[PDB]
Design a protein around this motif. Structure first.
Motif, PDB file in Angstrom:
ATOM      1  N   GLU A  95     -23.567  26.085  48.247  1.00  0.00           N
ATOM      2  CA  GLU A  95     -22.366  26.913  48.196  1.00  0.00           C
ATOM      3  C   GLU A  95     -21.976  27.236  46.760  1.00  0.00           C
ATOM      4  O   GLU A  95     -21.528  28.351  46.465  1.00  0.00           O
ATOM      5  N   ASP A  96     -22.125  26.267  45.854  1.00  0.00           N
ATOM      6  CA  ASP A  96     -21.824  26.521  44.448  1.00  0.00           C
ATOM      7  C   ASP A  96     -22.725  27.609  43.881  1.00  0.00           C
ATOM      8  O   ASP A  96     -22.256  28.509  43.175  1.00  0.00           O
ATOM      9  N   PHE A  97     -24.024  27.545  44.183  1.00  0.00           N
ATOM     10  CA  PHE A  97     -24.943  28.578  43.716  1.00  0.00           C
ATOM     11  C   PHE A  97     -24.601  29.935  44.316  1.00  0.00           C
ATOM     12  O   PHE A  97     -24.662  30.960  43.628  1.00  0.00           O
ATOM     13  N   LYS A  98     -24.245  29.961  45.604  1.00  0.00           N
ATOM     14  CA  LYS A  98     -23.885  31.224  46.238  1.00  0.00           C
ATOM     15  C   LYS A  98     -22.650  31.836  45.588  1.00  0.00           C
ATOM     16  O   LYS A  98     -22.610  33.044  45.332  1.00  0.00           O
ATOM     17  N   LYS A  99     -21.635  31.015  45.310  1.00  0.00           N
ATOM     18  CA  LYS A  99     -20.446  31.520  44.628  1.00  0.00           C
ATOM     19  C   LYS A  99     -20.784  32.012  43.226  1.00  0.00           C
ATOM     20  O   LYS A  99     -20.308  33.071  42.798  1.00  0.00           O
ATOM     21  N   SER A 100     -21.611  31.254  42.500  1.00  0.00           N
ATOM     22  CA  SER A 100     -21.971  31.630  41.138  1.00  0.00           C
ATOM     23  C   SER A 100     -22.729  32.949  41.108  1.00  0.00           C
ATOM     24  O   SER A 100     -22.572  33.741  40.172  1.00  0.00           O
ATOM     25  N   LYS A 101     -23.564  33.197  42.121  1.00  0.00           N
ATOM     26  CA  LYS A 101     -24.326  34.440  42.165  1.00  0.00           C
ATOM     27  C   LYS A 101     -23.402  35.650  42.117  1.00  0.00           C
ATOM     28  O   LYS A 101     -23.566  36.537  41.273  1.00  0.00           O
ATOM     29  N   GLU A 102     -22.406  35.692  43.004  1.00  0.00           N
ATOM     30  CA  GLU A 102     -21.480  36.818  42.998  1.00  0.00           C
ATOM     31  C   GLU A 102     -20.553  36.784  41.790  1.00  0.00           C
ATOM     32  O   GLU A 102     -20.148  37.842  41.297  1.00  0.00           O
ATOM     33  N   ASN A 103     -20.205  35.592  41.300  1.00  0.00           N
ATOM     34  CA  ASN A 103     -19.269  35.512  40.183  1.00  0.00           C
ATOM     35  C   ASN A 103     -19.887  36.070  38.904  1.00  0.00           C
ATOM     36  O   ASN A 103     -19.214  36.768  38.136  1.00  0.00           O
ATOM     37  N   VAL A 104     -21.166  35.793  38.665  1.00  0.00           N
ATOM     38  CA  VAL A 104     -21.820  36.164  37.418  1.00  0.00           C
ATOM     39  C   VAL A 104     -22.555  37.495  37.531  1.00  0.00           C
ATOM     40  O   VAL A 104     -22.558  38.284  36.587  1.00  0.00           O
ATOM     41  N   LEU A 105     -23.156  37.776  38.690  1.00  0.00           N
ATOM     42  CA  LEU A 105     -24.066  38.905  38.847  1.00  0.00           C
ATOM     43  C   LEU A 105     -23.389  40.263  38.682  1.00  0.00           C
ATOM     44  O   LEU A 105     -24.089  41.265  38.499  1.00  0.00           O
ATOM     45  N   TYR A 106     -22.057  40.327  38.695  1.00  0.00           N
ATOM     46  CA  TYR A 106     -21.350  41.607  38.655  1.00  0.00           C
ATOM     47  C   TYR A 106     -21.496  42.209  37.259  1.00  0.00           C
ATOM     48  O   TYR A 106     -20.638  42.064  36.384  1.00  0.00           O
ATOM     49  N   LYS A 107     -22.615  42.904  37.053  1.00  0.00           N
ATOM     50  CA  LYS A 107     -22.948  43.517  35.773  1.00  0.00           C
ATOM     51  C   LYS A 107     -22.981  45.036  35.834  1.00  0.00           C
ATOM     52  O   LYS A 107     -22.283  45.703  35.065  1.00  0.00           O
ATOM     53  N   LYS A 108     -23.778  45.602  36.737  1.00  0.00           N
ATOM     54  CA  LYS A 108     -23.967  47.042  36.839  1.00  0.00           C
ATOM     55  C   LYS A 108     -22.950  47.651  37.797  1.00  0.00           C
ATOM     56  O   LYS A 108     -22.493  47.001  38.741  1.00  0.00           O
ATOM     57  N   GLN A 109     -22.599  48.912  37.545  1.00  0.00           N
ATOM     58  CA  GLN A 109     -21.564  49.567  38.345  1.00  0.00           C
ATOM     59  C   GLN A 109     -22.127  50.125  39.651  1.00  0.00           C
ATOM     60  O   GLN A 109     -21.786  49.651  40.739  1.00  0.00           O
ATOM     61  N   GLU A 110     -22.992  51.136  39.563  1.00  0.00           N
ATOM     62  CA  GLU A 110     -23.668  51.678  40.736  1.00  0.00           C
ATOM     63  C   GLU A 110     -25.182  51.660  40.606  1.00  0.00           C
ATOM     64  O   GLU A 110     -25.870  51.139  41.492  1.00  0.00           O
ATOM     65  N   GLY A 111     -25.720  52.220  39.525  1.00  0.00           N
ATOM     66  CA  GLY A 111     -27.148  52.227  39.264  1.00  0.00           C
ATOM     67  C   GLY A 111     -28.030  52.869  40.320  1.00  0.00           C
ATOM     68  O   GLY A 111     -29.253  52.910  40.159  1.00  0.00           O
ATOM     69  N   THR A 112     -27.438  53.376  41.399  1.00  0.00           N
ATOM     70  CA  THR A 112     -28.192  53.871  42.538  1.00  0.00           C
ATOM     71  C   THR A 112     -27.640  55.206  43.014  1.00  0.00           C
ATOM     72  O   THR A 112     -26.463  55.512  42.796  1.00  0.00           O
ATOM     73  N   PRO A 113     -28.474  56.027  43.664  1.00  0.00           N
ATOM     74  CA  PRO A 113     -27.958  57.234  44.319  1.00  0.00           C
ATOM     75  C   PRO A 113     -27.404  56.937  45.704  1.00  0.00           C
ATOM     76  O   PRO A 113     -27.331  55.774  46.112  1.00  0.00           O
ATOM     77  N   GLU A 114     -27.016  57.978  46.433  1.00  0.00           N
ATOM     78  CA  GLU A 114     -26.437  57.828  47.758  1.00  0.00           C
ATOM     79  C   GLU A 114     -27.546  57.815  48.810  1.00  0.00           C
ATOM     80  O   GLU A 114     -28.735  57.716  48.493  1.00  0.00           O
ATOM     81  N   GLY A 115     -27.165  57.912  50.082  1.00  0.00           N
ATOM     82  CA  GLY A 115     -28.125  57.896  51.168  1.00  0.00           C
ATOM     83  C   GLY A 115     -28.845  59.213  51.377  1.00  0.00           C
ATOM     84  O   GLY A 115     -28.949  59.700  52.507  1.00  0.00           O
ATOM     85  N   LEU A 116     -29.344  59.803  50.289  1.00  0.00           N
ATOM     86  CA  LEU A 116     -30.105  61.044  50.400  1.00  0.00           C
ATOM     87  C   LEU A 116     -31.480  60.794  51.004  1.00  0.00           C
ATOM     88  O   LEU A 116     -31.930  61.539  51.882  1.00  0.00           O
ATOM     89  N   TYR A 117     -32.158  59.747  50.547  1.00  0.00           N
ATOM     90  CA  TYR A 117     -33.554  59.514  50.884  1.00  0.00           C
ATOM     91  C   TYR A 117     -33.662  58.629  52.118  1.00  0.00           C
ATOM     92  O   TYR A 117     -33.008  57.584  52.201  1.00  0.00           O
TER      93      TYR A 117
END
Ligand SMILES: Nc1ncnc2c1ncn2[C@@H]1O[C@H](COP(=O)(O)OP(=O)(O)OP(=O)(O)O)[C@@H](O)[C@H]1O
Ligand SMILES: Nc1ncnc2c1ncn2[C@@H]1O[C@H](COP(=O)(O)OP(=O)(O)OP(=O)(O)O)[C@@H](O)[C@H]1O
Ligand SMILES: Nc1ncnc2c1ncn2[C@@H]1O[C@H](COP(=O)(O)OP(=O)(O)O)[C@@H](O)[C@H]1O
Ligand SMILES: [Mg+2]
Ligand SMILES: [Mg+2]
Ligand SMILES: [Mg+2]
Lengths: 248, 84, 228, 236, 58, 415, 116, 398
Positions: free
Chosen positions: H375-397
């Protein structure tokens, strides 16, 4: 840069003008659609609500394309107008040719095809309008459809576009029961999600227009709710919120 | 500036002297801490041009590939004026 | 100067056609030899995957029962030109009741090619080797994106064009027979190919005056190959 | 500097916009297809839709005609346009000449249509690559945004292309397509080599000789996945 | 941190809409730090000169 | 959610104690005293005595060094600016002590007035500033180190695919020197400058190295970092003294390697720009051509970005011939492959024409890198012979692996 | 290193990587209880009059910055100063909120009606 | 010659567990260090000739000693020497000086009074260069790098294998690669690989920022680069690491920008040092940059930079290796299934995994736990991983 023209592929294969239109859709007013047993509804925010603006169309965001079809609108005003007129033209052409109402989905595809054209042929800016479709036919009953500026469409049971679209879709994901949703529950859900998505508090009725679609004795009546019923819907929502306050 | 003054004085010492200043863009660059020293040299040259006046036998020819870089004060009236 | 087919350069060159020859250069090697006995025509297949059907690689095409063609460069442009050649051969047969001369077929394909800029598009980035027998005998012609075309006794196109052309100049004479022409083409292809030569990396075609039929080789390739 | 127009050749003879068109395919979900002695099968990475989204409109396997179907990879709207044009052309060919359209002919038409959008400026190339499977003889072809078609015994396009093809070449054997169930199991395994969810994100369509299409329901596919797991359980 | 086996965190980026208390929190930390609190603005390290900003950072 | 509670002192003590402590304290203390002990050794040795010019004892063994110190006196170097010559009996001498001052002094009785000519440099005593000894003319040290004096081992047979470039180079830097009579007979003055330009790694510096290898004249490899001096006008003086030294030698050769450094474009819209570098470039321009003819000084200049050079410098009166080094053709690339694989332990069946055709747009440096990578591949799996497959893998790793993003599915567009 | 900045997405992802910056702490606009806490904090030295319910003041500030709350308190004090008094009234606080919450709209219905 | 000044390092003590084996190895280290201290303390204590030599030489030269620049050598014992003030003096060369060491431009020690040449200063190294030399080797080793087998192999073949085993290169005939650019997305292990190779190498290591080699004064930039590379030449087997070459390696272009032209001059001097006139010798160069496409082609071309090592975002196996390495010092529970973090497509790099481990440790400390859980690792993943904003396109493809 590879965003000067609609027909220029980015080195990663992304049409930047199309994505720009999709992101620009977020500027448009919030419009939401919910499917439910024996019903399907759209709701929209009036946005510009200045006191000197007379309200004479009563349907500035909701349009009636066919007898058993209606569409919302979110995008450029002129593009929305031409798209709605052309939707009506396609529906009436289908009715004249086949003497049968157009079965919703096809109509969507029709319009979507045209939008795709504006994203392929040069010298034409992509249609910066995304719109919801509600309808009923003899094949799949009540249907709700979502369109994109790119001309991509998808079937949905509850979805919103425009301002705070992500929050509305998350709220719908949380508070939608597939199969066991009725028109009244759908209206209550739409009212609450509009209240949460619209930053303005108390969700004044004249700032929100709701149009429902229901089958009544084989007449597929499309109704646009007058202000009076939206008053009582808002009062109902307020009294449910007061009742939920009792937990404290 | 001492070099410019001494060259002009040597030109004065000989009666029929012709001074030839090549690549005026170097010292004739417009003003804007070596800029200070370059300004001193250019202003000494300007003063030397302003010095003689009675149609003296000392005459000066300046050659440059750039005129935009050249200081407009160099052109003026009492200085190098024949833009050939 | 190198952005349109309508812009001349200070040297007078069109810096867009030369780019089409460059596009040719990254195709696949194609050797063609014209002898008094007929025309032989070899190509390196450049197989990309065993799953891919080798018959789908149309480096050799039949323009008609008497004339075959080899491409190099873009598939789309080459197939457009090949269809144009077939259509012109059929139209000439319809309007004249005779087989179109390979020189005239190359003329028609070149006439289509020259229109890259004529109307008030881009050059077809593909070289074509048209081999075939006509009323004057066996003939081999070569055409480039600019539409210029010329009869060649033995021509190499595609990648390895320079080395294959040099070796062709070394090993070609006027009185070669068809079998020795096939052998020379195959040895040159083996020497200019990064992959080991065998029955699946190359394809062969030939035309003869009295034997216009069998304008291809199917599993007799190994017969010539292991007798190299 | 030579990638802002479709009719400009690069100094090394590259049509860079045409090449860029293939990245749209590279961004699409994996679609695999194989041909057997009596069947042609094609699986699709059916990515999970939103909770409230209806998946009926999201179709990647589309039947061009009763004897030929098609699965795309790339932009969805361009795919819709190409599929509609292919259906219209197949019907027109059946109208002009009595015999039904061959899969080779429909692939040729699709490739020519895609090419004719890459020859003119002011006309964006189609950003889809298609796998077209049909009987005339089971035949499988693959198109290209460039406008080139090819005949394959087995492909996979989209997101997983190199990996799924790498799995495919040393899996497509004569005995692998000996049985219809064997061919469908091979397609399922090839799709599972990339789609790492299992069953819920796999959609396989099978067309038998002189038969009609049959989208595999998510219980037959579940049974085949269970059988594949049982067969692979021989490692221990 | 030594006993946990993890590496001590180093950088904290206080990001948000203006006037929410980022540099206010920095000031509060500086008041109770019992430690050196060298402060840098975002424009003091620019200079008109080449390599002088890097030298000043060093 | 539930807020995080603070960490009280009791909690800290428990977490740092309720666990491994049988050896943790001892291990940590041992590590700390290990660091302290290392610091102690480093401090206690801590000398690394710097080397100084102390000659072996038998070399000097001189107690008369102190006698030289006290008896002999230092002399400041100053050039005699002018001879006053008041009456040719008390002539007086105006001298300039570098930057100190200028003075009117007389010679010491040791030297003769005829031995002290005007303009030369002399040593003056520090007290009365009297001339004491004439001195040899100043030779800048860095300018004399700018010469090569050591021919590199790059012959002309190690530059493949540039036959036209080599012949045009030798027509300007070798032929007009060894056999000048082939020109004066036709009344042709050969070009006195060559600009070597092309893509990087095409072989400009290699050709310059070959020229220096078989020049037979004075070759000066100008360092672009020394014409760029801290003080105003010192780079221009550097150029002046360099050209003077070149003129002292009979028919010298100068190679301005990487001329873009001090050969930019003159400008003033930048509000100052370089100025000093522009002034040095302008003085180089003056030395190359103009008044005061340059002489028999053939000038070599190389740069793989020539479009940024000043048009005055690019004018064909300073850089007359403009030799262009282009990407080698197929034959040239085969020649480069043979040159760079000559010393390798490879097979005899390597089709170098194949490898040359596999690198369409590649410089000679890329060919050398391909050969080295083929050797590396043959070394990785420990084979003592590099086969053809190793060269193909090297070509893929060097050219194809970084050329473009045209993948094989995208490369299926051509057949 | 403590680094404070708006525009999180405009600084390059080379100092944003976890090694350079281990924690990214977001400072969202204060919620209603956070606004109440800020109001209590910045009105400690102000002489408030009974009937100065700060909950209702927090309601009247729908999503401020936090510095806007300090400005609200300062402007209420300014109204008190201009009236030469030392106490602060609830109406004073509400109208100071109104002044500080001055929003600039498009003021051009033509522009606002571009996006239907 | 002046052979390499390799950085000193203590032997690695493993296992890293807090056990008695670690105690015994560390105490062996302490024992030997105490032996060295005892010997070095009793050496000079028992020291009872050359003192006459010193009392003569130092008295003759006297203190202080001025440092001047040799300009000319007139006689066997007379030289024109320029003091630091730029004033030239004709001084005498005393006997106790090696006449072969005197070269024009050399730094010469002169007497304070008569400025006579009393010696020659050997090093005269710019302080901004002598600080680039590495004295304490970094603790990170090749065992602390998860995955990256191809990259490590390439860097070892480039800068490590030629030193230990030049036999292969000499036998086959290759000149070993003498330039490597480590390029890729940030946090992938470029600087970590530089630290590892510095730890492993027995050759001298020079660390540069690609921005400290840039100076205020007009000509000191290229001069500093030349000084750095000459120092690298002095200690013959040398490795020059220039992190963030993007600072100076940017593509050449024409603009007024009086400082940028000096920037380009510095980078031109760098590439001249890498591959220009005269050989470079046995000095390797390792360059790291996040963005390689913005570098000048003449800098990253072969011959100057022989190898371009790509550091991609770690894949599943590599990410699992990173997690195994960075939680090695941790005390994992039994309910932890690291796989869930390794799977999914968060595009997390090695630095991201390190931060995930650190934040999981902090999460465990929040619950007053010295052992981490899933659970600690799971919480840390979301806590730290928030780096990029979108980096992706929409559901075109589809
Ligand atoms: N024709 C050639 N034959 C053999 N080697 C060559 C050839 N051309 C280039 N090289 C190789 O290229 C290497 C580096 O090229 P070089 O030093 O001449 O670069 P350059 O083009 O002058 O670049 P820069 O812009 O840095 O001045 C040489 O060491 C040499 O081995
Ligand atoms: N492959 C890996 N194996 C182990 N640790 C790694 C790996 N990649 C990164 N790390 C960890 O990430 C930390 C920071 O990465 P590093 O310093 O190597 O960054 P980088 O790749 O040079 O990035 P930048 O572009 O910022 O220079 C290292 O100290 C190391 O602990
Ligand atoms: N949570 C808070 N509590 C009290 N005051 C606050 C708070 N947040 C911001 N402020 C006020 O904001 C002012 C400074 O804001 P500042 O830290 O500069 O915002 P930013 O860092 O976003 O520019 C201070 O005077 C402080 O009183
Ligand atoms: Mg602030
Ligand atoms: Mg060079
Ligand atoms: Mg790093």
């Amino acid at each position: 840069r590879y965003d000067s023209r609609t027909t220029i592929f980015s080195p990663e294969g992304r049409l930047y003008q199309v994505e720009y239109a999709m992101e620009a859709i977020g500027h448009a007013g919030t419009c939401l659609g919910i499917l439910a047993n024996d019903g399907v509804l759209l709701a929209a925010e009036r946005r510009n609500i200045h006191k000197l603006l007379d309200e004479v169309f009563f349907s500035e965001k909701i349009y009636k394309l066919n007898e058993d079809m209606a569409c919302s609108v979110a995008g450029i005003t002129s593009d929305a107008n031409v798209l709605t007129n052309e939707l009506r033209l396609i529906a009436q052409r289908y009715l004249l040719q086949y003497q049968e109402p157009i079965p919703c989905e096809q109509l969507v595809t029709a319009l979507c095809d045209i939008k795709q054209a504006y994203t392929q042929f040069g010298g034409k800016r992509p249609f910066g309008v995304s719109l919801l479709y509600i309808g009923w036919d003899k094949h799949y009953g009540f249907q709700l459809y979502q369109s994109d500026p790119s001309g991509n469409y998808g079937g949905w049971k509850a979805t919103c576009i425009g301002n705070n679209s992500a929050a509305a879709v998350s709220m719908l994901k949380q508070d939608y029961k597939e199969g066991e949703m009725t028109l009244k529950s759908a209206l209550a859900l739409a009212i609450k999600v509009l209240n949460k998505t619209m930053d303005v508090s108390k969700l004044s009725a004249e700032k929100v227009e709701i149009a429902t679609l229901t089958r009544e004795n084989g007449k597929t009546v499309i109704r646009v709710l007058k202000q009076k019923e939206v008053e009582q819907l808002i009062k109902k929502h307020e009294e449910e919120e007061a009742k939920a306050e009792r937990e404290k | 500036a001492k070099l410019v003054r001494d060259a002009f004085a040597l030109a004065k010492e000989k009666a029929p002297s012709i001074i030839f200043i090549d690549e005026l863009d170097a010292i004739g660059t417009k003003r804007f801490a070596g800029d200070r020293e370059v300004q001193r040299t250019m202003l000494e040259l300007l003063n030397q041009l302003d010095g003689f006046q009675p149609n003296t036998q000392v005459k000066v020819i300046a050659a440059t590939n750039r005129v935009d870089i050249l200081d407009p004060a160099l052109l003026r009236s009492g200085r190098l004026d024949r833009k050939i | 100067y190198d952005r349109g087919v309508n812009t001349f350069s200070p040297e007078g060159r069109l810096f867009q056609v030369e780019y089409a020859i460059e596009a040719i250069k990254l195709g696949s090697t194609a050797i063609g030899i014209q002898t008094s006995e007929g025309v032989c025509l070899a190509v390196e297949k450049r197989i990309t995957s065993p799953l891919m059907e080798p018959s789908s690689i149309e480096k050799i095409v039949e323009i008609d029962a008497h004339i075959g063609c080899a491409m190099s460069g873009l598939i789309a442009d080459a197939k457009t030109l090949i269809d144009k050649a077939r259509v012109e051969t059929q139209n000439h047969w319809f309007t004249y009741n005779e087989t179109m001369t390979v020189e005239s077929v190359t003329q028609a394909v070149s006439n289509l090619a020259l229109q890259f800029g004529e109307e008030d598009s881009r050059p077809f980035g593909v070289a074509l080797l048209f081999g075939g027998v006509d009323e004057k005998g066996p003939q081999l012609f070569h055409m480039d994106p600019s539409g210029t075309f010329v009869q060649c006794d033995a021509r190499a196109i595609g990648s390895a064009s320079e080395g294959a052309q040099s070796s062709l100049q070394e090993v070609y004479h006027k009185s070669m027979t068809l079998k020795e022409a096939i052998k020379s083409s195959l040895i040159i292809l083996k020497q200019v190919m990064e992959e080991k030569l065998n029955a699946t990396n190359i394809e062969l075609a030939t035309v003869q005056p009295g034997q216009n039929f069998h304008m291809f080789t199917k599993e007799e390739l190994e017969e010539v190959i292991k007798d190299i | 500097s030579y990638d802002r127009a479709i009719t400009v050749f690069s100094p090394d003879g590259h049509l860079f916009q045409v090449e860029y068109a293939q990245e749209a395919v590279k961004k699409g979900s994996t679609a695999v297809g194989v041909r057997g002695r009596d069947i042609v099968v094609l699986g699709v990475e059916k990515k999970s839709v939103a909770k409230l989204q209806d998946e009926r409109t999201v179709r990647k396997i589309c039947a061009l005609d009763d004897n030929v179907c098609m699965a795309f990879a790339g932009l969805t709207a361009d795919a819709r346009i190409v599929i509609n044009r292919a259906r219209v052309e197949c019907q027109s060919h059946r109208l002009t000449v009595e015999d039904p359209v061959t899969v080779e002919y429909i692939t040729r038409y699709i490739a020519s249509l895609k090419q004719r959008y890459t020859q003119s400026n002011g006309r964006r190339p189609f950003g889809i690559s298609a796998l077209i499977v049909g009987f005339d003889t089971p035949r499988l072809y693959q198109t290209d945004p460039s406008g080139t078609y090819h005949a394959w015994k087995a492909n996979a396009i989209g997101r997983g292309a190199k990996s799924v093809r790498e799995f495919l070449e040393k899996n497509y054997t004569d005995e692998a397509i000996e049985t219809d169930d064997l061919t469908i199991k091979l397609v399922i395994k090839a799709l599972l080599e990339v789609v790492q969810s299992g069953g819920k994100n796999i959609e396989l369509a099978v067309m038998r000789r002189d038969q009609s299409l049959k989208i595999l329901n998510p219980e037959e596919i579940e049974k085949y996945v269970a059988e594949i797991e049982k067969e692979k359980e021989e490692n221990e | 941190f030594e006993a946990l086996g993890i590496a001590q965190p180093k950088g904290v980026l206080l990001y948000g809409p203006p006037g929410t208390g980022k540099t206010l929190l920095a000031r509060a930390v500086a008041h109770h730090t019992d430690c050196t609190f060298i402060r840098v603005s975002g424009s003091e390290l620019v200079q008109k000169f080449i390599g002088e900003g890097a030298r000043m950072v060093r | 959610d539930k807020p995080i509670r603070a960490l009280d002192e009791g909690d800290i003590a428990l977490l740092k104690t309720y666990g491994q402590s049988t050896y943790s304290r001892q291990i940590k203390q041992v590590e700390d005293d290990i660091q302290q002990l290392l610091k102690k050794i480093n401090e206690l040795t801590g000398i690394k005595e710097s080397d100084t010019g102390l000659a072996p004892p038998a070399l000097w063994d001189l107690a008369a060094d102190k006698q030289t110190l006290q008896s002999e006196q230092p002399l400041q170097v100053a050039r005699c600016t002018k001879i006053i010559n008041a009456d040719s009996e008390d002539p007086k001498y105006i001298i300039n002590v570098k930057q100190f001052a200028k003075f009117v002094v007389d010679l010491s009785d040791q030297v003769a007035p005829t031995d002290i000519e005007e303009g030369m440099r002399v040593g003056v005593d520090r007290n009365k500033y009297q001339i004491h000894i004439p001195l040899p003319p100043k030779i800048d040290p860095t300018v004399t180190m700018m010469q090569v004096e050591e021919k590199p081992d790059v012959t002309y047979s190690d530059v493949g695919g540039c036959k036209e470039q080599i012949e045009k180079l030798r027509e300007v830097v070798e032929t007009p020197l060894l056999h000048p009579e082939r020109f004066v007979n036709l009344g042709i003055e050969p070009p006195k400058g060559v600009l070597l330009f092309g893509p990087p790694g095409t072989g400009k510096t290699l050709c310059a190295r070959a020229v220096a290898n078989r020049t037979d004249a004075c070759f000066i490899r100008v360092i672009g970092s020394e014409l760029v001096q801290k003080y105003v006008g010192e780079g221009a003086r550097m150029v002046r003294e360099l050209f003077e030294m070149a003129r002292t030698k009979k028919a010298c050769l100068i190679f301005f390697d990487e001329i873009d450094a001090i050969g930019g474009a003159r400008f003033d819209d930048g509000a100052g720009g370089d100025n000093e570098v522009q002034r040095t470039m302008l003085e180089l321009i003056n030395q190359l051509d103009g008044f005061d003819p340059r002489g028999n000084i053939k000038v070599l200049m190389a740069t793989n970005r020539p479009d940024t050079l000043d048009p005055a410098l690019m004018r064909p009166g300073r850089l007359d011939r403009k030799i262009e080094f282009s990407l080698p053709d197929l034959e040239g690339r085969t020649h480069i492959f043979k040159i760079h694989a000559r010393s390798m332990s490879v097979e005899r069946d390597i089709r170098f024409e194949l490898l040359a055709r596999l690198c369409p747009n590649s410089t000679g440096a890329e060919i050398r890198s391909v050969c080295t990578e083929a050797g590396m591949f043959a070394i990785r799996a420990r084979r003592k012979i590099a086969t053809e497959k190793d060269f193909l893998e090297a070509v893929n790793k060097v050219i194809k692996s970084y050329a473009k993003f045209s993948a094989t599915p995208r490369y299926m567009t051509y057949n | 290193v403590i680094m404070a900045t708006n525009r999180i997405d405009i600084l390059d992802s080379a100092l944003l990587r976890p090694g350079r910056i281990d924690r990214k702490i977001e400072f969202p606009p204060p919620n209603e209880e956070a606004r109440l806490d800020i109001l209590k904090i910045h009105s400690r030295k102000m002489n408030l009059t009974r009937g100065i319910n700060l909950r209702k003041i927090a309601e009247l500030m729908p999503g401020a910055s936090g510095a806007e709350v300090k400005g609200v308190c300062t402007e209420a004090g300014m109204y008190a100063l201009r009236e030469r008094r030392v106490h602060v009234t609830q109406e004073d606080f509400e109208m100071a909120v109104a002044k500080v919450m001055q929003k600039d709209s498009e003021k051009n219905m033509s522009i606002k009606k571009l996006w239907k | 010659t002046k052979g390499p000044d390799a950085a000193s390092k203590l032997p690695l003590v493993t296992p890293h567990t807090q056990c008695r084996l670690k105690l015994l190895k560390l105490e062996r280290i302490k024992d030997y260090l105490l032996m060295e201290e005892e010997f070095i303390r009793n050496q000079e204590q028992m020291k009872p000739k050359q003192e006459e030599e010193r009392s003569k030489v130092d008295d003759l030269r006297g203190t202080p000693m001025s440092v001047g620049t040799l300009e000319e050598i007139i006689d066997d014992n007379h030289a024109i020497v320029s003091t630091s003030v730029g004033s030239e003096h004709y001084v005498s060369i005393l006997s106790f000086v090696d006449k072969d060491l005197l070269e024009p431009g050399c730094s010469v020690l002169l007497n304070h009074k008569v400025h006579a040449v009393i010696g020659v200063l050997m090093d005269d190294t710019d302080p901004l260069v002598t600080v680039m030399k590495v004295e304490k080797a970094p603790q990170e080793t090749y065992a602390d790098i998860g995955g990256l087998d191809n990259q490590i192999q390439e860097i070892k073949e480039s800068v490590e294998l030629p030193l230990t085993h030049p036999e292969y290169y000499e036998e086959m005939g290759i000149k070993p690669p003498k330039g490597v650019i480590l390029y890729g997305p940030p946090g992938t292990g470029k600087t970590l690989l530089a630290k590892a190779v510095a730890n492993q190498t027995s050759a001298t290591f020079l660390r540069v920022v690609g921005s400290e080699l840039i100076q205020k004064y007009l000509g000191d930039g290229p001069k500093l680069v030349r000084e750095l590379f000459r120092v690298a030449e002095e200690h013959a087997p040398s490795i020059v690491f220039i992190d963030e070459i993007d600072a100076i390696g940017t593509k050449r272009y024409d603009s007024n920008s009086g400082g940028e032209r000096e920037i380009q001059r510095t980078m031109l001097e760098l590439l001249n040092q890498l591959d220009g006139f005269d050989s470079r010798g046995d000095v390797k160069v390792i360059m790291a940059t996040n963005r390689i496409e913005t570098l000048d082609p003449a800098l990253i071309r072969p011959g100057r930079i022989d190898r371009k090592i790509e550091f991609p975002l770690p894949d599943e196996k590599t990410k699992k290796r990173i997690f195994q390495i960075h939680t090695s010092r941790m005390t994992l529970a039994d309910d932890v299934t690291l796989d869930d973090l390794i799977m999914a497509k968060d595009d997390l790099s090695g630095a991201d995994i390190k931060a995930i481990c650190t934040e999981a440790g902090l999460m465990a400390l929040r619950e007053r736990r010295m052992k981490v859980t899933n659970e600690d690792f799971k919480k840390s993943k979301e806590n730290v991983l928030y780096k990029k904003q979108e980096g992706t396109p929409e559901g075109l493809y589809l």
